[PDB]
Amino acid sequence: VQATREDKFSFGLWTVGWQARDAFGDATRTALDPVEAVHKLAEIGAYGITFHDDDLVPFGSDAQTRDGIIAGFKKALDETGLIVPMVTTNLFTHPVFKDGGFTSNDRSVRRYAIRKVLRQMDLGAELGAKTLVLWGGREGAEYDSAKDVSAALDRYREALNLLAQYSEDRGYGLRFAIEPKPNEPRGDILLPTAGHAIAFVQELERPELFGINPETGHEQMSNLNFTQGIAQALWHKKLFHIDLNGQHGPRFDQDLVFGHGDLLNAFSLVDLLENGPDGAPAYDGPRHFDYKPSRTEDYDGVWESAKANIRMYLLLKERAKAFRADPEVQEALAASKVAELKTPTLNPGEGYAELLADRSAFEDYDADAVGAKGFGFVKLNQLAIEHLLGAR
Amino acid sequence: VQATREDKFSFGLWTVGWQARDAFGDATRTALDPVEAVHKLAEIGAYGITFHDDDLVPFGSDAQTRDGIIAGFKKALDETGLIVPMVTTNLFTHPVFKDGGFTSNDRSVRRYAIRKVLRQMDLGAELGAKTLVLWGGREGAEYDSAKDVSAALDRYREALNLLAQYSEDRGYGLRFAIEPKPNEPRGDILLPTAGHAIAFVQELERPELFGINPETGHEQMSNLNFTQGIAQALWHKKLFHIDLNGQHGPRFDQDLVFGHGDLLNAFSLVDLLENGPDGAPAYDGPRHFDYKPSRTEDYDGVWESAKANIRMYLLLKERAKAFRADPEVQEALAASKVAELKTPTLNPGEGYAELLADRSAFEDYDADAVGAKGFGFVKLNQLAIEHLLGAR
Amino acid sequence: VQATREDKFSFGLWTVGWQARDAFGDATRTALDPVEAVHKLAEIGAYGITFHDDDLVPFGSDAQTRDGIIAGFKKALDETGLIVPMVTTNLFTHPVFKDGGFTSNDRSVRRYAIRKVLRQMDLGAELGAKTLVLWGGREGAEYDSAKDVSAALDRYREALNLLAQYSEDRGYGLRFAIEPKPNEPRGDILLPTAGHAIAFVQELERPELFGINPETGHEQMSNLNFTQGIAQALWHKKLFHIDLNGQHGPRFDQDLVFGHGDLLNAFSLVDLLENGPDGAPAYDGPRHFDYKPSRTEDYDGVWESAKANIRMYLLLKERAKAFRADPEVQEALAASKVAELKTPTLNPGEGYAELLADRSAFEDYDADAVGAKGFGFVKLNQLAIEHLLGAR
Amino acid sequence: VQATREDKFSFGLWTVGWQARDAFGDATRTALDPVEAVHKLAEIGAYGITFHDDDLVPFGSDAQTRDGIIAGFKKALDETGLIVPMVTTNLFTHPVFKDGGFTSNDRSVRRYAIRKVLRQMDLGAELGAKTLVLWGGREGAEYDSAKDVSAALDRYREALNLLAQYSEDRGYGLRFAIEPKPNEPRGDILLPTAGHAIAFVQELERPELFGINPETGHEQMSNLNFTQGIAQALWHKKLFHIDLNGQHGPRFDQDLVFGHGDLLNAFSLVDLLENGPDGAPAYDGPRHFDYKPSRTEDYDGVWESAKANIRMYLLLKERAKAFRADPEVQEALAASKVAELKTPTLNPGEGYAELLADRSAFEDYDADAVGAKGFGFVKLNQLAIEHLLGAR
Ligand SMILES: OC[C@@H](O)[C@H](O)[C@@H](O)CO
Ligand SMILES: OC[C@@H](O)[C@H](O)[C@@H](O)CO
Ligand SMILES: OC[C@@H](O)[C@H](O)[C@@H](O)CO
Ligand SMILES: OC[C@@H](O)[C@H](O)[C@@H](O)CO
Ligand SMILES: [Mg+2]
Ligand SMILES: [Mg+2]
Ligand SMILES: [Mg+2]
Ligand SMILES: [Mg+2]
Ligand SMILES: [Mg+2]
Ligand SMILES: [Mg+2]
Ligand SMILES: [Mg+2]
Ligand SMILES: [Mg+2]
Numbered sequence A, B, C, D: 001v002q003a004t005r006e007d008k009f010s011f012g013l014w015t016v017g018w019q020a021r022d023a024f025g026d027a028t029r030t031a032l033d034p035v036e037a038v039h040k041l042a043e044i045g046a047y048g049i050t051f052h053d054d055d056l057v058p059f060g061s062d063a064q065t066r067d068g069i070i071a072g073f074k075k076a077l078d079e080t081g082l083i084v085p086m087v088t089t090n091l092f093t094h095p096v097f098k099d100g101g102f103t104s105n106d107r108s109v110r111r112y113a114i115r116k117v118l119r120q121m122d123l124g125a126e127l128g129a130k131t132l133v134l135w136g137g138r139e140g141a142e143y144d145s146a147k148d149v150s151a152a153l154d155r156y157r158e159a160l161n162l163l164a165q166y167s168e169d170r171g172y173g174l175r176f177a178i179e180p181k182p183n184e185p186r187g188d189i190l191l192p193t194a195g196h197a198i199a200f201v202q203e204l205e206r207p208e209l210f211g212i213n214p215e216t217g218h219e220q221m222s223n224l225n226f227t228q229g230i231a232q233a234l235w236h237k238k239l240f241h242i243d244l245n246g247q248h249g250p251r252f253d254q255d256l257v258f259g260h261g262d263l264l265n266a267f268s269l270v271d272l273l274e275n276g277p278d279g280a281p282a283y284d285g286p287r288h289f290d291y292k293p294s295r296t297e298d299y300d301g302v303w304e305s306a307k308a309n310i311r312m313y314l315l316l317k318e319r320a321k322a323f324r325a326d327p328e329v330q331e332a333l334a335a336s337k338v339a340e341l342k343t344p345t346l347n348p349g350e351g352y353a354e355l356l357a358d359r360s361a362f363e364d365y366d367a368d369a370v371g372a373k374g375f376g377f378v379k380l381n382q383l384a385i386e387h388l389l390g391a392r
Helices: A034-044 A063-080 A107-126 A149-169 A194-201 A216-220 A226-236 A263-274 A299-325 A327-335 A338-342 A352-357 A367-371 A377-388 B034-044 B063-080 B107-127 B149-170 B194-201 B216-220 B226-236 B263-274 B299-325 B327-336 B352-357 B377-388 C034-044 C063-080 C107-127 C149-170 C194-201 C216-220 C226-236 C263-274 C299-324 C327-336 C352-357 C367-371 C377-388 D034-044 D063-080 D107-127 D149-170 D194-201 D216-220 D226-236 D263-274 D299-325 D327-335 D338-342 D352-357 D367-372 D377-388
Strands: A009-012 A048-050 A086-088 A131-135 A175-179 A210-212 A287-289 B009-012 B048-050 B086-088 B131-135 B175-179 B210-212 B287-289 C009-012 C048-050 C086-088 C131-134 C175-178 C210-212 C287-289 D009-012 D048-050 D086-088 D131-135 D175-179 D210-212 D287-289
Touching: A009 A299, A034 A048, A034 A063, A034 A299, A048 A086, A086 A107, A107 A131, A107 A149, A107 B352, A131 A149, A149 A175, A149 A194, A149 B226, A149 B352, A175 A194, A194 A210, A194 A226, A194 B194, A194 B226, A216 A226, A216 A263, A226 A263, A226 B149, A226 B194, A263 A299, A263 A377, A263 C263, A287 A299, A299 A327, A299 A377, A299 C377, A327 A338, A327 A377, A338 B149, A352 B107, A352 B149, A367 B107, A377 C299, B009 B299, B034 B048, B034 B063, B034 B299, B048 B086, B063 B107, B086 B107, B107 B131, B107 B149, B131 B149, B149 B175, B149 B194, B175 B194, B194 B210, B194 B226, B216 B226, B216 B263, B226 B263, B263 B299, B263 B377, B263 D263, B287 B299, B299 B327, B299 B377, B299 D377, B327 B377, B377 D299, C009 C299, C034 C048, C034 C063, C034 C299, C048 C086, C063 C107, C086 C107, C107 C131, C107 C149, C107 D352, C107 D367, C131 C149, C149 C175, C149 C194, C149 D226, C149 D338, C149 D352, C175 C194, C194 C210, C194 C226, C194 D194, C194 D226, C216 C226, C216 C263, C226 C263, C226 D149, C226 D194, C263 C299, C263 C377, C287 C299, C299 C327, C299 C377, C327 C377, C352 D107, C352 D149, C367 D107, D009 D299, D034 D048, D034 D063, D034 D299, D048 D086, D063 D107, D086 D107, D107 D131, D107 D149, D131 D149, D149 D175, D149 D194, D175 D194, D194 D210, D194 D226, D216 D226, D216 D263, D226 D263, D263 D299, D263 D377, D287 D299, D299 D327, D299 D377, D327 D338, D327 D377
Parallel strands: A009 A048, A009 A287, A086 A131, A131 A175, A175 A210, B009 B048, B009 B287, B086 B131, B131 B175, B175 B210, C009 C048, C009 C287, C086 C131, C131 C175, C175 C210, D009 D048, D009 D287, D086 D131, D131 D175, D175 D210
Antiparallel strands: none
8 A cells, every 4th residue: 555645644743753752761863854854754655744833943943043944844845745734832841831821820821822822823824734733731730729620711712712813814714623632741631532622612702613633542541432532523523633643541642653552443443534424534634643653763763653654544444445345244234223323213203292102112112022132243343353354 | 517408418219229239249238118218318418319210110110000109209208308309211221222222223222212211201390300310321332333423423412302392392491411421331432521421412402401410430430530520511501410429540330439439539529519609609409429339238338328428528518618718728829820810811902913012922021930930739739638638 | 264172262151141231231131051052162163161150050059950950061061072171169249258258357258158169179170170260359348448458368378278278188180270350349359460369379388289360351451461461470380271351441341252352462462372482382271261242242142252252363363373474574573682682681601790890781881872773663563463454 | 747767758869859851841940959959858857868870970970970979978968867778770761771771672781781780789788778679660562572571571580680699799788679660661561560570579589688669659550459559568578668659540650749649548558557567567668759749840849749748648647546546446347347357267277178067167058148247348438538537
């Protein structure tokens, strides 16, 4: 399998560029040049690159430096044909954001965090980015009495409403994607799951401009089913972007290559995104990898890991397609009544009164008899794993 | 401290009545008589009792039987002065519900599930209940290919819209509270956290009628901060009811007495619920205990465990109040800038244009200097714990 | 592929026989006749069957009844050629065991538990069983002050020493396997992981007769690496038996078909067991499936699920074999230096004196240059998964 | 209360000296001077200080500098009266240890790692340290095929045997304490729990010289009961040292102040360590705090957090003693039969022959009557908690 620009694989500059300085050790790799990253990614098949303001322009560069950097990066994109589908802002690294950006208890920090993002929005718009991802990594707490959650959601909302106002007024046409994470680096982060993030967005001034950027590992850190979470996000039409990676349950954020953590869930996920209604994907945006090349690797291992993400995604896609195309799967699906869930429970024009008058729905219903029929779900599941395994 | 009707402690018939038949062993206690339950609960200070249809009327009782039981029950309520603030429906025990009630793959089960709930709505209406709790315990799956989540949400929505229509046409005035649970009995349950449930409710036809019934242990099964999810629910104004109990992280659902699991979080929760806005509670509904007397206990143990729930709450309430009235705490709160979060980030009439014109919010902002000042959060936490321990 | 007696696949009578009564619902299936279970298992390729005393002979059956059941069971065995490689005792279902068997706080229960086991040893010995599995499911506590752990371990040891004595004196030649589990049904179970069980066994009077019976999902309930724990069990030479199944991290005990939980760990487990040192398997006992057919299934789903366990094991075995016979994998292993771990750190006859004298081990060691070399682990992991996916 | 030297509270230099650089952000505090650290800790009540070689002497320090630093340090200890009860070696920070120290796939690194420890043993013996703590933070893997566990355990053993040989021959009199941790920084670390570590130690050449150093947070990262594991550690007589801190279940290692995570388990732990048999503590070593002052704090917050550790331990101690001394508790303990567990199951001189002859242990045992009696565990738990809340 080979990647095409239509696959829409994107990578964050901070992914292949991670120097591997973890919580217990020093960096094991040297810094990666943005221009070189552009060339190497173009080379392995990516269609786009993303970055945090501070990944491209060192925090505190003068305008002369900032400008030179932007010019060079812009050239590289030019020469390679890579686009910038999304940009994000770093509101977590600098010590000033130790209690958050938008929700820091310190008012001055909140004013500053907003300005930092407005600026990144400008650059984003200039490079043609369409999505602004917001990962509130420091919004949250270690102790319950330290953060008024209500006040915090008010301030989170105040800040986002201004951002949409600005984008709309400047005609940027950005979409905003809130990225949920349950913990790390704060003891607990606000808007911990895809669900909490969706509920929150529904309360903004222009909710139509807002959605989520869920990440595989983030939902897995809570032992949640990532595919089912995405399915819900799709039902709401709030899946604006997606970060793919691997994780092994509730533990520190691993950021493994996509499919190197929960493989079975990685499979059902590609199936969901690609085998959409009427053949077409159910999702049209970037297939963004927010992962980290393991600390035990060098630059060779880095490029290898970048390609492993693409490989994993295309090998799974290939098996999801075959799963669905298999007449034996098709028969097991019918036996399990998976599609019967699509038929309304109620008949056309039927309401409570017609339902209450239907004796077959209650008075004459044989619950014991229906309760004994099997659904044949183990067999259908075994058919899926055999396709995954390349055994069918 | 002693319980008053104003404390609003309620218990489910199924809590003290749990015979302790678990996944690996037989029941260790004989059945509890409902009238007896009512009399005993009245005695320990409960102001209300709740029940699933099947807890009071054995599945399949003829109408004469059913009628007989309801009349005895109402009499016990009458004699003791206990009310029924909420009722619910058992859509999980009978084999017919093995794949769900409202979202079973089987259309006939779905129709039957609605009829079972309508019937319970009529009895709740009859007893004066104000809330209908819906715990979709069998809605979900063990395998990703077995359940079309999108269609499941459509059918979940279809069923709820009908229930609201009916209540509203008959003038029942019920409020509906969806109870989220991440797993057990299904590998994964639909609407797994408080967040997922709130996002869902915002998509119904009469949203104002729907909220959630979050459970301490259910959010903890995913390692989430219960107090923090309750704060968000309150922020959305969707906290319609609450189920209190104890749990020790992600493992099977323990249903311990409130405060016997994560005690620190039990403390911050009571503080949040009672030390509300004015001086008044932030929440006005029933403090419902959805717990189980451990399998090792006989009926003396059951009544002790019921009392323990009430004692934990009142003991926590007393320390929450003392914490807040402490001048040393007020001082720590001022140093940590907790209240500063409540002041808008922007000055009245300030927009993005005024923020961009403020050089002090960015160009002349000394991030380094601000990033060096500590928040004094540990100290504040330490004062909170010392209040919990009666050390101050 | 097809299973052979040489594969040594065994099933507990309680797996295919699970009536599917869970913590929240009634059984969805009727009881399975033991004789019929023997015939069906023989037919799908099992080499053996195992059972708890109470699975075969209903608790409290008079001697004539028991004798009768046993005789019919033996006939079925004879007729099919299946063996009974292991037997176990139910010390968890009856209310009497609510606080444990060997470690109940009540002395009379501890005496009765031992007698129940002696009786099962006799029957095991008569059926030719070589292993007695001990799963102390009720040994533990819900509350810290309710159980004296030190006293519990003494009582535990006291019971086990007696059983070994009896066995040795009767010439039964049994081997004893303790089965660890972290929780469920007790809040916390004694000897929670394979490590704790092994350390305990080392303190018995005759440690050589004792090992462990680790279960896939039990270690995963604690989010531990099952394969790595089996590796340590093998290092200690204490892997006496193994229970294979599937689990999705920390949550209730799911007991899915082997491979339907963490697929990547199932793969590396089959690799460890079969591609042992010297071509041959590293482990030769039974490959026992301790799982449960999902509650949504009927008897067809039950046999399908029984065959899925064997299929899963044989498919992974085939891929594990191909993995190792791949010259590219071999090249990647040499680059990752996996085998170099097997070479002693010290040279032959070298001690601390010689080591202290080797300047190349410290004084002239270039930590920094060594630290920059990559291990190629990601690429090796990618090749493993490509084999698993049948992509190579 | 007030800490005394008899309380034996110790802290590592790396605790209060943690600069607060986490996986997602820069240091928020300046470096702490070791002499100042000695002085500050002496002031708050610590009786000892501990450190990693690299905490004191910067990696790659010339002999002159190293010596310079030690001499200043010894003077500070002299002056303050603080001792060094334990020393440890950093085998996790430098890039050369990316794949481990003692079990690195690379043989040259294994040799270097032993040299680095030998050198710390010398400094430790010189400062009067009693225990050598060994935390194998990089021993493990991210991918199963990358590490031969059996070979890794051989090399781990090989290195330890040598260190013991050396210490014995130089007459240093050290005890070695292996510190288990389930994950972080490696995906999976070797010897993941207290159990696995004890089992391992039992396989060394001079096992009497090896024990464990369990850490509260480490066992909780796997959702295990810390108190119960320490109780097993004490039963085996392998509790050579203990690391105290707080954690909120399975997530990144938080390193909170002791008792700031699972408060109920912190209570039961203090009870176990202090209300030992013969009135006296069951444990007599250092009460060492391996925690981290939150990133949101300045140097004032740092000293506050250091003192919080001592206060938590002494407030808990005080309540555990009150608890045991309460007559109502004594009554509850009796009804729960906690002490009956200490009486042998068998009468003195009884063996299996006499047990088999006792009809009252089986044939005439009424399991049903015994199964109906409750143990009063909830009431007992409720009393423990009221004691912790200062409510009695
Ligand atoms: O957990 C880290 C987060 O995933 C970030 O990579 C965001 O996506 C970008 O700030
Ligand atoms: O996990 C069990 C659930 O909490 C139920 O008790 C509901 O609250 C009512 O069906
Ligand atoms: O968790 C259930 C246990 O694994 C049992 O199946 C034992 O293996 C035997 O009693
Ligand atoms: O999680 C890290 C470890 O706990 C260390 O602090 C050790 O105890 C000393 O290497
Ligand atoms: Mg991440
Ligand atoms: Mg991300
Ligand atoms: Mg509930
Ligand atoms: Mg519950
Ligand atoms: Mg099991
Ligand atoms: Mg088992
Ligand atoms: Mg430690
Ligand atoms: Mg730690």
